[PDB]
Amino acid sequence: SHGLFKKLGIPGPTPLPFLGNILSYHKGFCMFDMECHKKYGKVWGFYDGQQPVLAITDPDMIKTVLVKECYSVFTNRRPFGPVGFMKSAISIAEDEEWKRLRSLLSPTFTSGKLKEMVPIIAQYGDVLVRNLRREAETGKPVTLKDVFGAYSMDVITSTSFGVNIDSLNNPQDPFVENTKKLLRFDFLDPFFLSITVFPFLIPILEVLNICVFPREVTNFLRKSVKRMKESRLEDTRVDFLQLMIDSQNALSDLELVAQSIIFIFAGYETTSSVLSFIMYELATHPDVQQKLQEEIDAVLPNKAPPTYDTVLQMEYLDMVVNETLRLFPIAMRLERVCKKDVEINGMFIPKGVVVMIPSYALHRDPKYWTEPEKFLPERFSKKNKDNIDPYIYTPFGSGPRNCIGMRFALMNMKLALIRVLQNFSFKPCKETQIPLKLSLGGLLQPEKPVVLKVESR
Numbered sequence: 437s438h439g440l441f442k443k444l445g446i447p448g449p450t451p452l453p454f455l456g457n458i459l460s461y462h463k464g465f466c467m468f469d470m471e472c473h474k475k476y477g478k479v480w481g482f483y484d485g486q487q488p489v490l491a492i493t494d495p496d497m498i499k500t501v502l503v504k505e506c507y508s509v510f511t512n513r514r515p516f517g518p519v520g521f522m523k524s525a526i527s528i529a530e531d532e533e534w535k536r537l538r539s540l541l542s543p544t545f546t547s548g549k550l551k552e553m554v555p556i557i558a559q560y561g562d563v564l565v566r567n568l569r570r571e572a573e574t575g576k577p578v579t580l581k582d583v584f585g586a587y588s589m590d591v592i593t594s595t596s597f598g599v600n601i602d603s604l605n606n607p608q609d610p611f612v613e614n615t616k617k618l619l620r621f622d623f624l625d626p627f628f629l630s631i632t633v634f635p636f637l638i639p640i641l642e643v644l645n646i647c648v649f650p651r652e653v654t655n656f657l658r659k660s661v662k663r664m665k666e667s668r669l670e671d672t673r674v675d676f677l678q679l680m681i682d683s684q685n686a687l688s689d690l691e692l693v694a695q696s697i698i699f700i701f702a703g704y705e706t707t708s709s710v711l712s713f714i715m716y717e718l719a720t721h722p723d724v725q726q727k728l729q730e731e732i733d734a735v736l737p738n739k740a741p742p743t744y745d746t747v748l749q750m751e752y753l754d755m756v757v758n759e760t761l762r763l764f765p766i767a768m769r770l771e772r773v774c775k776k777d778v779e780i781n782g783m784f785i786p787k788g789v790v791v792m793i794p795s796y797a798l799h800r801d802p803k804y805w806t807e808p809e810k811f812l813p814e815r816f817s818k819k820n821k822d823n824i825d826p827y828i829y830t831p832f833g834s835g836p837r838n839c840i841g842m843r844f845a846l847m848n849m850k851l852a853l854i855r856v857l858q859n860f861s862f863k864p865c866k867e868t869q870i871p872l873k874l875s876l877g878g879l880l881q882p883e884k885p886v887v888l889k890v891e892s893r
């Protein structure tokens with residue numbers, strides 16, 4: 437079992453029994469990957485408990501697994517712990533289950549729908565500005581994540597469901613309260629450490645109704661969507677929620693609820709985390725913040741409201757987003773379960789091996805980015821933009837299994853950026869941690885919440 441990579445002549449760190457190389461994650465897995473690539477070259481192997489994982493860095497080899505051989509050999513991700521009814525969520529579904537969900541849902545995020553989401557989010561822009569404006573009157577430091585989370589919460593419920601929930605006016609509110617508790621994939625937590633290591637356990641927890649998602653959070657989330665469904669049943673916009681009732685003429689009751697959670701989570705978690713990273717970056721590189729404010733002000737003269745089209749006009753904003761995602765790619769790795777023995781670009785890979793693309797590492801590889809640790813948007817300009825491999829920069833993954841809400845995360849993040857910047861400026865203070873330190877566990881977050889001060893323009 438543990439001799440796989442030795443017998444295939446692939447480098448790697450030497451693994452202990454039972455544990456695999458799991459202990460090397462103590463320094464966080466993004467750093468572990470760094471060390472590895474650096475130590476072992478272009479390809480290397482390790483063991484997550486008894487699980488072989490092959491890291492891969494060749495840009496072609498990557499396009500092969502992500503784009504060409506996806507449907508036939510690398511279709512799935514790693515199965516991960518007790519999930520229960522959430523076993524049908526799109527991000528977790530496999531093979532045949534997945535293809536349908538992927539096409540049943542993909543039509544949620546087309547131009548027409550995206551354009552149609554603008555004016556609803558336009559309402560939640562103001563409430564954000566107006567909210568932050570009060571902190572600019574109180575004049576004491578701000579938890580970006582808090583207030584961006586609220587914004588995030590507001591926009592996902594209202595678009596994917598058509599049901600306003602007024603989160604921003606609620607410093608206290610059950611929706612966010614529960615959605616943040618939904619999954620902390622933390623190794624300090626013996627639980628995740630132990631399932632991840634000893635997976636022979638997972639089927640047992642599945643019979644005992646235990647789940648990685650607290651029974652609590654999921655109870656409140658099932659009931660909410662249970663209800664949001666029957667709200668619509670009362671009235672007489674084809675959206676996420678709609679599209680799925682329309683399928684109820686093959687997507688079942690619980691199936692319908694499970695997509696919502698994924699969406700809700702994605703919508704809430706990702707969006708707010710990234711926006712906090714960017715505002716940190718802007719406020720620690722003031723030149724860029726002014727540059728961005730000028731661009732915005734030039735495209736949206738005298739605080740004029742952002743629209744679908746103006747947003748895509750904003751080239752620097754895009755450079756700013758892209759560079760922050762380079763530095764902080766919130767999925768730190770991409771992964772695909774190899775389901776049949778196969779040979780990709782001069783390499784055999786046996787059935788069952790998890791193939792793994794260390795995004796965080798590839799993003800910081802001093803072999804593809806001059807001064808890779810530094811925040812430099814100009815690397816994303818038209819001028820320098822073509823010199824950038826689409827299989828090295830993978831913040832939304834790639835191929836058929838790539839991020840389904842990319843275009844919606846982006847439009848939405850920018851919408852919020854614009855509206856903030858065209859009213860406020862942001863500055864470091866005494867509790868603002870410099871430079872930033874990622875936390876060690878599953879999620880890519882800062883170990884201390886993002887706090888900045890806000891001046892009113």
Ligand SMILES: CC(C)c1nc(CN(C)C(=O)N[C@@H](C(=O)N[C@@H](CC[C@H](Cc2ccccc2)NC(=O)OCc2cccnc2)Cc2ccccc2)C(C)C)cs1
Nearest residue numbers: 484516527528618619621632698701702706767771839878
């Ligand atoms: C110790 C070793 C095995 C580990 N490696 C990792 C890193 N890793 C593979 C992860 O991505 N972590 C976890 C994870 O969040 N990914 C899985 C888990 C499904 C999880 C569903 C979920 C999550 C939280 C709460 C409720 C439901 N993912 C999910 O739906 O993601 C929403 C999302 C996130 C980012 C961008 N777009 C969408 C799927 C996924 C991963 C990356 C991007 C998109 C989907 C699981 C593997 C447990 C964690 S533990």
Ligand code: HEM
Nearest residue numbers: 527702703706766767831832833834837838839840841845
């Ligand atoms: C900036 C915010 C976001 C980042 C950085 C991001 C990143 C990703 C990445 C890298 C993947 C994996 C691609 C792959 O595995 O090849 C992913 C998967 C996915 N994302 Fe996004 N995402 C973001 C926002 C969203 C939003 C807003 C939604 C939905 C509303 C979303 C829904 C999904 C789903 C459902 C999957 C699994 C796709 C599948 O297996 O078919 N994520 N996310």
